[PDB]
């Protein structure tokens, strides 16, 4: 039970970490970088 609770807590931490990195990497330079990379991928 403790291992399951700890694993769920780690998964929630990973979720919130991805959410916070979506804003950390949102610095206009890296954001434009990812945007033009996605544009070249779809094109």
């Amino acid at each position: 039970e403790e291992e399951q609770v700890e694993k769920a807590r780690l998964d929630n931490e990973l979720m919130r970490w991805r959410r916070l990195q979506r804003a950390q990497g949102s610095d206009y330079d890296h954001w434009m970088e990812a945007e033009t990379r996605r544009i070249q991928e779809m094109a």
């Binding site: 039970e1 694993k7 769920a8 929630n12 979720m15 919130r16």
Partner: protein, 303 residues
């Protein structure tokens, strides 16, 4: 720490946003004769409207045994109030069920409960015998219908104990305590339930919300704000398709999923609609509706 991330109180939505979101989700304000939102803000369909939609959609390809069961369920209180005329409607439903789907535990248990409310214990016995003859073994629902009919008609404690012991022997009802305590528990449950006329049971409470639109559209049923009691029709259809595609994961509740469900790490940020109000969408107009001929008359209660 003292600065709150989320806030449940005070509220974050005025009165106009209630109507805006109600019209945005895709719901329609039906008249009271069709249905309304009860005290628990749950949508409730009038038995008359249930029988009407039954008569109109009994021939379509999407009708189902479960739909007939729900129609009998909606008719149950009217059957309890007037067992003379509403039993005719129940019998018509059973006739159509035999025409389309045939013998089924669902329809048989539904008509057994209908007879139990209508105070027809000979009819309940006949239905049980018909199930046994057709080969549909009596289920736990059938034995509980037996017990309810016994308690309602006035059959004695030993008469109900006979059916409970028969259910135990058959195995449809699983008991984890002594038989006496199990029967006591079932009888206390049925006594707290009561009937639509016995002034003690829950069914005696006829108070209703009587509101065409729920009071709080952002009411939560679970834990987080994303588990809203009222959602859009696209998301509702998503839930409906998930209930059938992933019916296996519903069987087990594991502590992993339990601790994952905690929304302490879920994002709670103000979307643009949290500032601009719910997006304005047109409501379903009813210009094609005929003029109300009895607009001056007052509509009565459901049951």
């Amino acid at each position: 720490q003292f600065v709150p991330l989320h806030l449940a109180f005070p509220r974050r939505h005025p009165n106009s946003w209630q109507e805006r979101q109600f019209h945005l989700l895709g719901y329609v304000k039906w008249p009271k004769e069709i249905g309304f939102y009860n005290a628990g803000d749950n949508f409730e369909l009038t038995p008359q409207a249930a029988y009407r939609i039954y008569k109109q959609n009994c021939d379509e390809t999407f009708w189902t045994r479960l739909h007939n069961e729900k129609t009998i369920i909606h008719l149950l209180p009217l059957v309890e109030q007037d067992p003379g005329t509403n039993m005719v409607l129940v019998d018509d439903i059973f006739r159509h069920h035999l025409k389309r789907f045939g013998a089924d535990h669902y329809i048989y248990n539904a008509v057994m409960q209908a007879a139990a409310f209508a105070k027809d214990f000979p009819r309940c016995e006949q239905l049980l015998a018909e199930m046994r003859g057709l080969g549909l073994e009596p289920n736990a629902q059938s034995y509980v219908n037996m017990m309810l009919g016994a308690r309602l008609t006035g059959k004695p404690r030993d008469q109900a104990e006979a059916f409970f012991r028969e259910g135990i022997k058959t195995g449809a009802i699983s008991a984890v305590m002594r038989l006496d305590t199990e029967f006591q528990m079932w009888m206390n449950q049925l006594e707290r339930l009561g009937s639509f006329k016995a002034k003690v049971g829950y069914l005696s409470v006829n108070e209703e919300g009587a509101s065409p639109m729920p009071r709080d559209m952002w009411a939560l049923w679970g834990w987080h704000r994303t588990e809203a009691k009222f959602i859009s029709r696209k998301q509702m259809i998503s839930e409906q398709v998930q209930n059938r595609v992933r019916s296996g994961k519903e069987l087990v509740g594991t502590v992993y999923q339990k601790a994952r469900r905690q929304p302490w790490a879920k994002y709670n940020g103000m979307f643009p609609y949290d500032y601009n109000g719910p997006a304005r969408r047109p409501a379903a107009s009813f210009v094609d509706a005929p003029t109300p001929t009895h607009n001056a008359e007052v509509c009565g209660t459901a049951y």
